[PDB]
């Protein structure tokens, strides 16, 4: 994150302020979501399950999220992707 | 004529279980097991991770794993036989001894 140096005599002593992660749970994961017949892929992060659901989080942090279409994006169709699962992928223009 | 070589500390033993820890950390945690704890992550989502940082996506990856892998394949396999082949390889080493 960041660092702050100190003198010392014929030398100099540096404060590293790390990001250390800790508390790490075990998740389902998935490469690629299949809903409307073409894959899905997470812009940034990664899917994860808790056994009945799936949610996308951040690498470095869990933060379900549900899976919006402003989340991950479409390329391509589902019978190439090795390990492809079905999910629904929520659409924010269909509610409003 | 009073010259003695002295053995190292570490056997070669323990630097082959150092550098298989080191290859077992990379293939099963990604980066993370150096910043902190082995976070267990799949292969073909760490590789995803480091096309994403290469700066590309990673449908090319989920879609060309197979082409990927054979490729990967292909180069240990050269790299293996050029270490067979040509003598001068480690060269370094063998001057600095």
């Known amino acids: 994150l960041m660092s702050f140096p100190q003198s010392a005599p014929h030398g100099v002593v540096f404060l590293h302020v790390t990001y250390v992660p800790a508390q790490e749970k075990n998740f389902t994961t998935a490469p690629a979501i299949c809903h409307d017949g073409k894959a899905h892929f997470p812009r940034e992060g990664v899917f994860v399950s808790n056994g009945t659901h799936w949610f996308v989080t951040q690498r470095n942090f869990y933060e379900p999220q549900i899976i919006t279409t402003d989340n991950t994006f479409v390329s391509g169709n589902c019978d190439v992707v090795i390990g492809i699962v079905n999910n629904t992928v929520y659409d924010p223009l269909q509610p409003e | ?97």
């Open chain 2, 1 to 97: 004529n009073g010259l003695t070589v002295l053995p190292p500390l570490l056997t070669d033993e323990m630097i082959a279980q150092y550098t298989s820890a080191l290859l077992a950390g990379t293939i099963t945690s990604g980066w993370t097991f150096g910043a902190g704890p082995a976070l267990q992550i799949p292969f073909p989502m760490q590789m995803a991770y480091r096309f994403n940082g290469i700066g590309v996506t990673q449908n090319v990856l989920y879609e060309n794993q197979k082409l990927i892998a054979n490729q990967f394949n292909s180069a240990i396999g050269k790299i293996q036989d050029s270490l067979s082949s040509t003598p001068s390889a480690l060269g370094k080493l063998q001057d600095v001894v």
